Each structure stands twice: as structure tokens, then as C-alpha cells.
Symmetry: C2
Subunit: 445 residues, 2 copies
């Protein structure tokens, strides 16, 4: 019954127990309860990047294989933009850092810098939307520091997530402006259409999002009773379990009750809700309740004699533990679908609050490591010098003293505090220059 | 301009020239014009198998890896059915027979034989629907002979296609009833829920469909001018090309014309039609017409001064070469979408007619090899003995005399002729037994 470790006490053991008991992985094989999430991501993110104008393709490091073809295909300005995406499998913590995983990576080349920069952020919005709209996970959109960007590019943009149980940042996905670096390496060039004396190099970007989203989702929403599945990616959204069946239930009445479960299932599915029944009567209803609790099914309908007689469903909401009575009539599928949208909203809100609570604005060095030790991320004033970023990570690792304990930069958030950074000195110990921005620091995955 | 070999004269060179000039493959890399087809298949077939109740998953020969897990997961009858699908890439003629390709394969295990048999045919209907409804390719649904089935199973069902240019059958996809063979190998078992003294073995099936569908599609519909893309899988369904622009076109009038192309594009896309413009004016309109002809864009809109003035689009239909005038007004997107549905219908009809014309019912041995040599498939009476099937292939190979020349069985069609087989002797040379069925024979891919 339940889960063998609390998140607050032993997070690694909690996570392994959850992913196993919820039937997400088999020691990895990705079983359907987890895979459905990836299928949802593929549909949703796939749709968005198609709609932007990116096309899918299949290639048998991606850049070393692809960019020679880009050179070949770009014969003149009329071949631009080249905008290609691939869904594939790249070759440990399951769904966080693994030897094999699935992802999507896009590579584009444009005639102008503006075009390339604009797509970089469009794609980042898509990734943000994945986390927020599908997975109910809040993110920080921002830009990586020089130190933390993708080495082959000009700048890297990111959606940074927060793992409360361990007080660590996790990079959610990234979108890179590669500028003209790679065109120079791979001899990607075209004649300027307005001046045939001159050769230009396209502006390239690349961007990827992987099954890491699933691990983030688990870590963000799971609780001490098990997984809590965001409803938009829950393979089963509602489980229907018969209750109140005893020694003295007549066969007429037992049949009716089971039949009503099937009927309910049918009515919900016809209304678009992913419902199913659990009619394994060799297990108690309690055992069945636990099984689906651990999986994180968003809603459980307990259908007994009185629910039948009163045409009134008893609904247990997994994330909140709340209980609702929902009328069983023509409006039931819409009502349940609305309750699933509220569930999304509430899960997102609760996670966002937790995130913001654990984002701590630190202006004095002496409070930096104690803040980390409170399992918080830190927003601190920074002058922008790499040396200062390096000193923060060194000094924080040395004061803290098997995961890393030094704090790195996570991103420079696009949404900056109202409080001006310029009023403060750069955060590093002994530093004196006026800050120019706030940057988000933390211990990280 | 155009294609360098006729289908009727050198089919291999024709096919290579098409797939290259239509930008389908790069020597394979699957470029978007072809990949979009696979994306369409994934959506359509994916949807159907989800709706049947199959779930997707990810495993790092599939049976040797998967079936031990099936043994593990099936702890009792309450774990059945296990119904799992994977979209992945397995490791020459591009899209026909290649070292690497993409496919989908499903593996199910059920408690009862009836359940397993029923799904086998449901899945086969899905595959038939792929070819027919997406790709406008006709098929023969049938059962493989004992000799031609998947060796590990009890029986194999198939959708067989016909390649007219070379007079050969091509297996389109297969769905296998594996019975209890594999459960015995892999110790997949459960206690009979109605008798706990007894152990039962589940009934399994497996089924796959690959990017071979794309090669079949090309071979079936392509003509001597290039590819002809079925409209439901055409990445671009309508191409808009400006025409009638001369030395003396004023800049006011050139701007208006280009703007009207963009506007048309916008109006069609808003109505659900995949339209785009080709405004590369460094090429003649003729050159542009050829380029999209070779790619097989279903409809071309030629938008000139008079089309603008008369609010009347000149539409060239790729498969038929027909020309239509389509009014440019509020109804244009629906009208064009309807014309694209007619295009689907017509392509399917023309291919079906060709197929049926080349299906020849042969009752005398002496006409068998000459029929093959007419680039036809053959429906012939068969007693059902493997020996007779073997003799047909031997005798046909010996009389015909670098592809194979012997005829194999393709399938026993579920749709049998009205003419009773029993009226005839088995087809093989010298054979004497009354036939029990008609079977489809041919030279094959
Ligand atoms: Mg730089
Ligand atoms: Mg905390
Ligand atoms: Mg200060
Ligand atoms: Mg047998
Ligand atoms: Mg012929
Ligand atoms: Mg006879
Ligand atoms: Zn500084
Ligand atoms: Zn015979």
C-alpha cells in the first residue's frame, strides 16, 4: 500500500518506487502510463512546430550528419529557409538522465538574423507551452549565461524548472541561436540576391525537447501517496470503481451496479473523457483505490447502491483529496470534463506558488549558501562578468562542504524583478561592481 | 525537364529519377515531401489503433526482447489483454527494400482465441484503409498460404498490391495470428479463472506496416511526367504560380498580381487546404510548372491578369491533365477542397481498374506463364496442397527462362470469384485433384 519513502526524506527512493508502482517503467522500457505522456507531447508540440512552418524529415551528432546536406541543399537564397525537425531516439536517473531517450530536435537556417532570432523564441514558447499547458509545470523563460550556453552557438534560451523536494534547478528544454558559426564550418553559403559579388552565410538555430519532460512532471507533481497525473496527459483521466457490494447484495442488484459502471464509462467516453472501469472484484475496492491513487488517475468515481439510487456520483479528486457529488444525467460528461480542467488549473497554480515561494532574491553574499541550504533557488544581482559567475560556484561549493553543492547559473530570466539590479553590488563575495541584471542561481540536476 | 525514362521502358531508372527530382530522398535521407506521407500515416493509423484499444510504448528481434516481459506482466487472467504498439526504426530499393526503415509494429496477447482472431482482421482493415483511404492504392485482402505465412505463427493475413509497370505483386502489410506458439516458447501462462487446477496460454498476434507504403504509392500512381501525389498525403495540395507577367506589366499591376497570390494562399489555408505560392520569378512559369508537376502537387493554380480580372482561377489537375475554371469568391476554399476529394476518388478508381484488368483468371496450365509474361497477376484454382504451390513456382520459373521469374502465391483472397473453384482441376501442370479455392499467384517484389 502507498509509497515506501516520503519525498522530503529520501527523494531518490520515492521516485523509483513511484515510477515502478505506477507502471511507468520496467527495468528502461517505457510502459503506456508514461509513454502516453510522450504521445501527447508529440501531438501537441508536433502540431505547433508544423504550424510554424517547420517540416519533419528522417536522417539515418546531428550537426555533423545534417549540415553537409544543408550546404548541398542551399544553392541560392531561393532555398531558404531550411526548417527541419526530427522525432527520434538518442543514445542514470529514469527520464532525467539516461543512456537512451527520445526527443525531438529541429535545425533551421534562414537568410536574415532577425528571422532566426524570432524563431528561436517562438520555439521556446512552444516548449514553455508544453510544460505549462500539457504538464501543468511552471517554468522560467530566460537566456543562458555565456558560460552555460551551447558552445557551438551565439546564445542559448531555456525554460528552467524547479525540483522542490531537493531544492534543485532542472533545465527543461533549450532553443539555441547558432548565428553563422556553423555555416562557416560546413561551407553553407549563398550569393546575396541583391549583390552577386558577395557570398552570405545563413543564420542557423537548433532546438530540442526530450522525455526529460516526463521526469520533471513526476518530480513536480508526485506526492507522498504516489504519482499525480496532469489530466491532459493522463492515459486514463477517470477510473470508475464499484463499491458497497456485500454478502447480501442480490444478483439482480450486483448486475445492475456493474452494468451502470459500464454505462457510465460509455457516456463519459462519448463526451470525450478518457474513462475506464476497474471491475477486478478479487481485490477490495480499497486495494483498487490504492492502485489508481498510486498511478495518479486524476478522478476516481466510486459507484455504489446510493450513487445509483440518487443518480449522484461520488468523485474523489486525486491532487487535492477533495470529494464532489456530481449529478448523473445528460450533463455528466461536460461536468466531469470541466472538473478535469479545474484539476489542471489547480495543479499548475499550486506548482507555480511553490516555485515562486522558493525563488529567493538574495543581495548579501552571507545569505547565499544558507538559502541554498533551505532548498531554494536564488535571484541575485550580477554585473555580467564570467569571472563572478565562476567565483559564486566555487565559493558556494567550498562553503557548503553525492550531488554537486556549488550553485550555477540557471538563466537570466526574461521577466526581471521591478527592483533595479543597478542599486546593488554584484553578488559575489568581495565584489564591488554595480550589477546590471538579476540572474537565477541554484544547485542543479 | 520531365523524367528521363518511361515507366514502361525502364522502371528502375524511372523510379530513381522520380524520387530524386521530386525531392523525396537524398542519397537514404527521407526529405519532407516523402516524410509528410509517413507523418500522415502515423496520425491516421495511430488514431485507429488507439481507438481499438492498443497502447503505445517504448522498448530499448522484437519477440525475443518483448515476450519475456509479456511473461512477467501477465500474472493472471486479470492482466489480459496485453496490447502494445511501437513506432520505430528497424535495421536495396528506396522505400521498397532497404537496410534501414521506419515502421510500426503491434504485439497483443488475449485470453481467448476468438478475441485474438478478431483483432488480427481489425488490424488488417486498418492497413487496407491506409492504402485505400490515404494513399488511393487498391489492395487484395487475403490469407497467406501455409508456405508463405510468418513461420512463427498459425496464419498470416495480408493486403497485397500490384505494380503494373513490371507486372509484380508487392506485399503491402501483414497481420499474423501467432496462436499459442510463442506463449509456449516464452512461458507466458495464467491460471484458468474458472479452474485453478489448469494453466492456460494466451493467444497472441503481431502486425506491422512500414515505409514500404510510400514506395508502393509512388509505383502505383507515378506517371511519365513524374510523381502524382495522392491529395490526402500531399504536403502541398495546391501550388499557386503567377503567370502573364511581361516587359510591359506595370509595377502597380505586378504588385497587385503577387499580392493576389498571397491572398489566395491565405484564403485556401484558412479553409483547410494546404496551399502555397511559387514566386521565384528568376524561373519562367513553365519551369515552375515542371518542378511541381514532377513533385506531383495535386492542383496547380495559374493566376494571371485575366484570372484576376474575371475572379476566375485556372486550375490544372495533375493526375488527369484536366483544366478547370474555379470562381474566386467566398466558396473557393470549399470548392478546391471538393476538387481534392474528387482527385482522391479518381486516382483510386483508375488504380483499382488497372488492378482488376491485370488480375487474370487462368484455368489451363499452358496459359499461366504467358499471362505472367503479359505483366499480369493470376487467379487460378488450387486444391490447397503445398506440393502444388511448389510445382507452380518451379515450372513457371523453368518455362520463363535479375529478378525472380517464378510465380509465388500472393494470397488466398477473402473475396473469391462467383465461379466455383470445384468445377476445375488444380492449376499445376499435370494436376488432377478438384480445386478447393482460387488463389492469387504472381511474380513478386
Ligand atoms: Mg559569442
Ligand atoms: Mg521547500
Ligand atoms: Mg548592497
Ligand atoms: Mg499450423
Ligand atoms: Mg499491363
Ligand atoms: Mg479444367
Ligand atoms: Zn561581478
Ligand atoms: Zn493440387
Amino acid at each position: 500500500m502507498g509509497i515506501a519513502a516520503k519525498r522530503e526524506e529520501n527523494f531518490s527512493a520515492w521516485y523509483i518506487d513511484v515510477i515502478t508502482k505506477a507502471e511507468m517503467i520496467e527495468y528502461y522500457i517505457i510502459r503506456p502510463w508514461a509513454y502516453y505522456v510522450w504521445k501527447c507531447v508529440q501531438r501537441f508540440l508536433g502540431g505547433k512546430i508544423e504550424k510554424l512552418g517547420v517540416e519533419d524529415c528522417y536522417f539515418p551528432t546531428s550537426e555533423t550528419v545534417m549540415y553537409p546536406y544543408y550546404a548541398k541543399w542551399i544553392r541560392s537564397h531561393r532555398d531558404l529557409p531550411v526548417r527541419l525537425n526530427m522525432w527520434n531516439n538518442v543514445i542514470p536517473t529514469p527520464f532525467i538522465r539516461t543512456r537512451e531517450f527520445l526527443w525531438q530536435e529541429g535545425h533551421c537556417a534562414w537568410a536574415k538574423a532577425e528571422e532566426c532570432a524570432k524563431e528561436v523564441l517562438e520555439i521556446l514558447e512552444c516548449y514553455a507551452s508544453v510544460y505549462e499547458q500539457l504538464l501543468a509545470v511552471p517554468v522560467v523563460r530566460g537566456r543562458k549565461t555565456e558560460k552555460e550556453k551551447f558552445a557551438g552557438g551565439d546564445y542559448t534560451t531555456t525554460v528552467e524548472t524547479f525540483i522542490e523536494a531537493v531544492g534543485r534547478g532542472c533545465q527543461g528544454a533549450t532553443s539555441h541561436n547558432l548565428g553563422q558559426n556553423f555555416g562557416k564550418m560546413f561551407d553553407i553559403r549563398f550569393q546575396d540576391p541583391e549583390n552577386n559579388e558577395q557570398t552570405l552565410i545563413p543564420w542557423q538555430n537548433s532546438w530540442g525537447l526530450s522525455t526529460r519532460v516526463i521526469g520533471v512532471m513526476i518530480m513536480v507533481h508526485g506526492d507522498n501517496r504516489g504519482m499525480v497525473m496532469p489530466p491532459r496527459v493522463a492515459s486514463t483521466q477517470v477510473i470508475i470503481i464499484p463499491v458497497g457490494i456485500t454478502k447480501d447484495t442480490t444478483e439482480e442488484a450486483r448486475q445492475e451496479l456493474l452494468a451502470s459502471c459500464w454505462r457510465l464509462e460509455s457516456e463519459l467516453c462519448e463526451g470525450g473523457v478518457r474513462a475506464r472501469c476497474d471491475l477486478r472484484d478479487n481485490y477490495s475496492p480499497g486495494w483498487r483505490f490504492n492502485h489508481w491513487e498510486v498511478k495518479g488517475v486524476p478522478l476516481r468515481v466510486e459507484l455504489g447502491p446510493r450513487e445509483l439510487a440518487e443518480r449522484s456520483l461520488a468523485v474523489a479528486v486525486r491532487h487535492s483529496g477533495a470529494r464532489h457529488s456530481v449529478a448523473w444525467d445528460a450533463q455528466t460528461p461536460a461536468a466531469v470534463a470541466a472538473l478535469l480542467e479545474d484539476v489542471h488549473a489547480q495543479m499548475y497554480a499550486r506548482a507555480k506558488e511553490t516555485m515562486e515561494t522558493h525563488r529567493v532574491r538574495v543581495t548579501e553574499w552571507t545569505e547565499f549558501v544558507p538559502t541554498l541550504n533551505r532548498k531554494c533557488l536564488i535571484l541575485a544581482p550580477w554585473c555580467g562578468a564570467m569571472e563572478c559567475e565562476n567565483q559564486v560556484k566555487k565559493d558556494s561549493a567550498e562553503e557548503s562542504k553525492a550531488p554537486s553543492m556549488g550553485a550555477k547559473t540557471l538563466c537570466i530570466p526574461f521577466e526581471q524583478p521591478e527592483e533595479p539590479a543597478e542599486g546593488h553590488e554584484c553578488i559575489c563575495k568581495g565584489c564591488t561592481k554595480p550589477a546590471t541584471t538579476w540572474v537565477l542561481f541554484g544547485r542543479s540536476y
